[PDB]
From Swiss-Prot, chains A, B:
Disulfide pairings: 49-114, 62-94, 63-96, 68-78, 260-272, 302-377, 307-381
Cytoplasmic side: 431-433
Organism: Eastern equine encephalitis virus
Stretches in topological domain Extracellular: 1-409
Localization per record: Virion membrane; Host cell membrane
TM annotation in the entry: 410-430
Subunit relationships: The precursor of protein E3/E2 and E1 form a heterodimer shortly after synthesis. Processing of the precursor of protein E3/E2 into E2 and E3 results in a heterodimer of the spike glycoproteins E2 and E1. Spike at virion surface are constituted of three E2-E1 heterodimers. After target cell attachment and endocytosis, E1 change conformation to form homotrimers. E2-E1 heterodimers interact with host VLDLR or LRP8/APOER2 to mediate viral entry. Interacts with 6K protein.
Residues carrying sugar: 134, 271
Function of the molecule: Class II viral fusion protein. Fusion activity is inactive as long as E1 is bound to E2 in mature virion. After virus attachment to target cell via host VLDLR or LRP8/APOER2 and endocytosis, acidification of the endosome induces dissociation of E1/E2 heterodimer and concomitant trimerization of the E1 subunits. This E1 trimer is fusion active, and promotes release of viral nucleocapsid in cytoplasm after endosome and viral membrane fusion. Efficient fusion requires the presence of cholesterol and sphingolipid in the target membrane.
Span within the parent record: 799 to 1239 of 1239
Record's comment on post-translational modification: N-glycosylated.
Region (E1 fusion peptide loop): 84-101
Protein name: Spike glycoprotein E1
Membrane topology of this protein: Single-pass type I membrane protein
């Protein structure tokens, strides 16, 4: 047998519900989410990390000059330098005259943390959602099960042909352009992939680690070697993306609302418990039994001992009753106002016993079912002093329904007499003639 | 210097435009699309292909029976068979009495074409668009360049800092659920991945080739071995997806409108030339020159020799002119009505020469530019008898503008006299008193 439902998103809290059938004894369930897994169809786009800058041997002669070329490197420079006149220790100044020979050829390359550590710049696409649950139904114990959100998924565990949702709600806080270092992760508005951002963030403007395409600019500029010093004075840009690696902010996981978190590899969002889920599950109709063979109900009465409106099922109340014959029988809460600790109990002969429950009410007047026999225990006044309550408006009290009807009736009656007055007068005036 | 524009989607046709500047001599361009590449962010979901069905050794004894188990296979069956009494050639019937021993244990598995050939069932997501062009600008020859649609893309070729679009139009004919065999490809409405479609299309209901998860049903049912024959008579489903492999249809590439095609690996749509593209390109302002140093225009006149409205630039007309001094100078067509074969010509002293052009017009009256000097050559009447034309309404002829003004003026004048009549009469009637 298959029974379906729409359950609200309750990542932590369990969910029982008794399920019955004419001529058949009922059976309960217990569904309880274990995971929520929201996997976008993302991908990385390009990486970035610190650069490096090397210099080849700067040319030199006694006179004349060599020539600067396009030694292929990012931001690479080279320039002749004339009348160099540089000395070497215990030397002869490398000339007899104007040296004129100094190219100061340059080179820019990439750092080595890049291997260990580099940018992780992503485009994040639609992708999927899934989730894990636990079913402890009927006669079944903890059966934790995981499946995708899609309202189609045919999944059978034992006799449970799971069909899930899909969820009413349709969003997770993500973004197409989100980057990450280490455990942390950050929506970078856009990693300016092709566009060399002066190295300000695109310090390593490369598709991959192994993609040796540095469309970045350290703005390397050479200065004239001088002072008889063999060197390549120069300038270039500081590692701007590192400069931001001083200005890193709050990772999104730390900002994710609904007190829920994220998984690294799939960008699985983790249990932002929002929405409702139209689930559909097959049950073993064999697990049913008859309805007439059952120890039957009778002599229905329950005593509302006491509840104080608190989170824990902070209310105890009992029953007083006489049975057809002893045994066991479920006590479902079709109205989960006083959220019952219990869902199924033994029913001994004259089952006259208690139970526990929480409602946010100052007091209810409600009822629920037991052993295919819904009985009424209204719910006394409740003292005040993680988890839910009833809380909608069930906290109703005496004075509320007292004064509301007081004022309504007073106004109604007075205005009714008022309107009566007019025709009451007019009738005999008509009678005059 | 940077100049931008919005060019319409012209996949094949070239595009020149002269670009000028005050105090600066102008320069032309020539843009011409080479590719259009529309890459969705797709993926495959699951595969399907022919099955296979094997049988283990069916049990046998002299009497009694062995037992059928859950030999784990898709659609696997097994059933005892009693009083089998089967013979073997030159044997002794394998019994002395009721055999009772025959399990007919079964097995279903997968075919081997699956390796070579299986389904390719996809979810197709947003993804991107890009395209290739050729620029032959100014003094530049064929420079074919490729880049993504995004209105951001900073791309420099030579001095051309390309920024592209993005395209006005925003769609390609695709679908999330599209499948493919071989070169062909088909929108399968939905490949019922988890749901065993009786093997009707989900004959191999598996995530991957190596995913050995066959959530499919050949509906294998055994028949009783009999007739003293050792065998496993049975039934199961024919390869339904193959049955459709008889009912394959028209691949989408063959149905793709805009006479354009598709690329296999990225689902790159190929040059459905629709829309307009706001491109932005930097030019070498150094490639400019002055404006005063130029051989100057004078003595402007062009002879409209003849054009017949046809596709090819089927119209020739000339100029008659005297120059300040000889040289060269561009002839841009700001009004590309008569689509000029020419865009830039030498300007010898008294440059009095010709050119070619097509317009759909029966006759224009229009003009365009030459050497920073727009001159007028109206466009004679055109005979009638791949590529564009002017074609909007420029095919205007004499009788059209003749009769339109004829009828308009006649109606206007007659109604004007008509309205005049009234007050014309009334005035002297007023005068009477």
């Amino acid at each position: 047998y298959e029974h379906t439902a729409v359950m609200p998103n309750k990542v932590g809290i369990p969910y029982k519900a008794l399920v019955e059938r004419p001529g058949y004894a009922p059976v309960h369930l217990q569904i309880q989410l274990v995971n929520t897994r929201i996997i976008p169809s993302t991908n990385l786009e390009y990486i970035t990390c610190k650069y490096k800058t090397k210099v080849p041997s700067p040319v030199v002669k006694c006179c004349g000059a060599t020539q600067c070329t396009s030694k292929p490197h990012p931001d690479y420079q080279c320039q002749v330098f004339s009348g160099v006149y540089p000395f070497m220790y215990g030397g002869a100044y490398c000339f007899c005259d104007t040296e004129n020979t100094q190219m100061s050829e340059a080179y820019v390359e990439r750092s080595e943390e890049c291997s260990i550590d580099h940018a992780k710049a992503y485009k994040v696409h639609t992708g999927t959602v899934q989730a894990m649950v636990n079913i402890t139904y009927g006669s079944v114990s903890w059966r934790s099960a995981d499946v995708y959100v899609n309202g189609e998924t045919p999944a059978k565990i034992g006799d449970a042909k799971l069909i899930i949702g899909p969820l009413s709600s349709a969003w997770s806080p993500f973004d197409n352009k989100v980057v990450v270092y280490g455990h942390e992760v950050y929506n970078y508005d856009f990693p300016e992939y092709g566009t060399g951002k002066a190295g300000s963030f695109g310090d390593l403007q490369s598709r991959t680690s192994t993609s040796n395409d540095l469309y970045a600019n350290t703005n390397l500029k050479l200065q004239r070697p001088q002072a008889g010093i063999v060197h390549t004075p120069f300038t270039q840009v500081p590692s701007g993306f590192e400069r931001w690696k001083k200005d890193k902010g709050a990772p999104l996981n730390d900002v994710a609302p609904f007190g829920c978190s994220i998984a690294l590899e799939p960008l699985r969002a983790e249990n932002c418990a929002v929405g409702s889920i139209p689930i559909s599950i097959d049950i073993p109709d064999a697990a049913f039994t008859r309805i007439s063979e059952t120890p039957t109900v009778s002599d229905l009465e329950c005593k509302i001992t006491e509840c104080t409106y608190a989170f824990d099922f902070g209310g105890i109340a009992t029953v007083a009753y006489k049975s057809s014959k002893a045994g066991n029988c479920p006590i479902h809460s079709p109205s989960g106002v006083a959220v019952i600790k219990e869902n199924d109990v033994t029913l001994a002969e004259s089952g006259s016993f208690t139970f526990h429950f929480s409602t946010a009410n100052i007091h209810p007047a409600f009822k629920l079912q037991v052993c295919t026999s819904a009985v009424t225990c209204k719910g006394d006044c409740k003292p005040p002093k993680q988890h839910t309550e009833s809380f909608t408006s069930a906290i109703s009290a005496t004075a509320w329904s007292w004064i509301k009807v007081l004022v309504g009736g007073t106004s109604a009656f007075i205005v009714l007499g008022l309107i009566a007055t007019a025709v009451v007068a007019l009738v005999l005036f008509f009678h005059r003639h």
